[PDB]
Amino acid sequence: QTQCQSVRDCQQYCLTPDRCSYGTCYCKTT
């Protein structure tokens, strides 16, 4: 269960991601 492969995935999801980590793309302020 990996929402993302890499920060890339979050970068489209979120203007300022934290990490693609824990199979869930963490966003720094969203």
PDB file of N, CA, C and O in Angstrom, residues 3-19:
ATOM      1  N   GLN A   3       0.921   4.890  -1.614  1.00  0.00           N
ATOM      2  CA  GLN A   3       0.293   6.003  -2.321  1.00  0.00           C
ATOM      3  C   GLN A   3       1.243   6.644  -3.340  1.00  0.00           C
ATOM      4  O   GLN A   3       0.792   7.203  -4.336  1.00  0.00           O
ATOM      5  N   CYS A   4       2.550   6.611  -3.059  1.00  0.00           N
ATOM      6  CA  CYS A   4       3.585   7.234  -3.867  1.00  0.00           C
ATOM      7  C   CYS A   4       4.758   6.287  -4.006  1.00  0.00           C
ATOM      8  O   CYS A   4       4.946   5.383  -3.191  1.00  0.00           O
ATOM      9  N   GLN A   5       5.554   6.542  -5.039  1.00  0.00           N
ATOM     10  CA  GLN A   5       6.828   5.905  -5.302  1.00  0.00           C
ATOM     11  C   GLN A   5       7.952   6.820  -4.821  1.00  0.00           C
ATOM     12  O   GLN A   5       8.986   6.338  -4.359  1.00  0.00           O
ATOM     13  N   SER A   6       7.801   8.140  -4.982  1.00  0.00           N
ATOM     14  CA  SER A   6       8.880   9.090  -4.733  1.00  0.00           C
ATOM     15  C   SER A   6       8.287  10.479  -4.525  1.00  0.00           C
ATOM     16  O   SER A   6       7.134  10.711  -4.867  1.00  0.00           O
ATOM     17  N   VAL A   7       9.062  11.421  -3.983  1.00  0.00           N
ATOM     18  CA  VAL A   7       8.611  12.774  -3.700  1.00  0.00           C
ATOM     19  C   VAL A   7       7.867  13.406  -4.888  1.00  0.00           C
ATOM     20  O   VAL A   7       6.859  14.068  -4.679  1.00  0.00           O
ATOM     21  N   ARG A   8       8.322  13.139  -6.120  1.00  0.00           N
ATOM     22  CA  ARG A   8       7.643  13.359  -7.388  1.00  0.00           C
ATOM     23  C   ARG A   8       6.114  13.275  -7.282  1.00  0.00           C
ATOM     24  O   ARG A   8       5.393  14.183  -7.694  1.00  0.00           O
ATOM     25  N   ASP A   9       5.624  12.164  -6.740  1.00  0.00           N
ATOM     26  CA  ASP A   9       4.220  11.861  -6.589  1.00  0.00           C
ATOM     27  C   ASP A   9       3.579  12.916  -5.690  1.00  0.00           C
ATOM     28  O   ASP A   9       2.554  13.518  -6.023  1.00  0.00           O
ATOM     29  N   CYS A  10       4.223  13.199  -4.556  1.00  0.00           N
ATOM     30  CA  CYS A  10       3.715  14.270  -3.727  1.00  0.00           C
ATOM     31  C   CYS A  10       3.851  15.631  -4.399  1.00  0.00           C
ATOM     32  O   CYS A  10       3.038  16.497  -4.129  1.00  0.00           O
ATOM     33  N   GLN A  11       4.881  15.874  -5.215  1.00  0.00           N
ATOM     34  CA  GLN A  11       5.105  17.191  -5.805  1.00  0.00           C
ATOM     35  C   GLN A  11       3.921  17.601  -6.685  1.00  0.00           C
ATOM     36  O   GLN A  11       3.527  18.764  -6.683  1.00  0.00           O
ATOM     37  N   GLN A  12       3.327  16.660  -7.425  1.00  0.00           N
ATOM     38  CA  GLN A  12       2.096  16.921  -8.129  1.00  0.00           C
ATOM     39  C   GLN A  12       0.906  17.048  -7.160  1.00  0.00           C
ATOM     40  O   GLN A  12       0.009  17.852  -7.396  1.00  0.00           O
ATOM     41  N   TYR A  13       0.890  16.275  -6.067  1.00  0.00           N
ATOM     42  CA  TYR A  13      -0.197  16.309  -5.084  1.00  0.00           C
ATOM     43  C   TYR A  13      -0.282  17.623  -4.287  1.00  0.00           C
ATOM     44  O   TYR A  13      -1.369  18.076  -3.934  1.00  0.00           O
ATOM     45  N   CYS A  14       0.876  18.179  -3.931  1.00  0.00           N
ATOM     46  CA  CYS A  14       1.092  19.189  -2.897  1.00  0.00           C
ATOM     47  C   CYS A  14       2.175  20.145  -3.372  1.00  0.00           C
ATOM     48  O   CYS A  14       3.198  19.708  -3.891  1.00  0.00           O
ATOM     49  N   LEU A  15       1.992  21.448  -3.140  1.00  0.00           N
ATOM     50  CA  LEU A  15       2.990  22.445  -3.505  1.00  0.00           C
ATOM     51  C   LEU A  15       4.285  22.229  -2.716  1.00  0.00           C
ATOM     52  O   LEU A  15       5.369  22.354  -3.280  1.00  0.00           O
ATOM     53  N   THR A  16       4.180  21.925  -1.415  1.00  0.00           N
ATOM     54  CA  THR A  16       5.339  21.719  -0.547  1.00  0.00           C
ATOM     55  C   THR A  16       5.234  20.403   0.235  1.00  0.00           C
ATOM     56  O   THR A  16       4.884  20.406   1.421  1.00  0.00           O
ATOM     57  N   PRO A  17       5.534  19.264  -0.398  1.00  0.00           N
ATOM     58  CA  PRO A  17       5.552  18.011   0.300  1.00  0.00           C
ATOM     59  C   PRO A  17       6.647  17.944   1.359  1.00  0.00           C
ATOM     60  O   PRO A  17       7.616  18.703   1.324  1.00  0.00           O
ATOM     61  N   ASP A  18       6.470  17.030   2.312  1.00  0.00           N
ATOM     62  CA  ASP A  18       7.462  16.697   3.312  1.00  0.00           C
ATOM     63  C   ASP A  18       8.281  15.532   2.780  1.00  0.00           C
ATOM     64  O   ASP A  18       9.485  15.669   2.561  1.00  0.00           O
ATOM     65  N   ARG A  19       7.622  14.392   2.539  1.00  0.00           N
ATOM     66  CA  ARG A  19       8.270  13.213   2.014  1.00  0.00           C
ATOM     67  C   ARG A  19       7.252  12.296   1.349  1.00  0.00           C
ATOM     68  O   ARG A  19       6.138  12.137   1.836  1.00  0.00           O
TER      69      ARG A  19
END
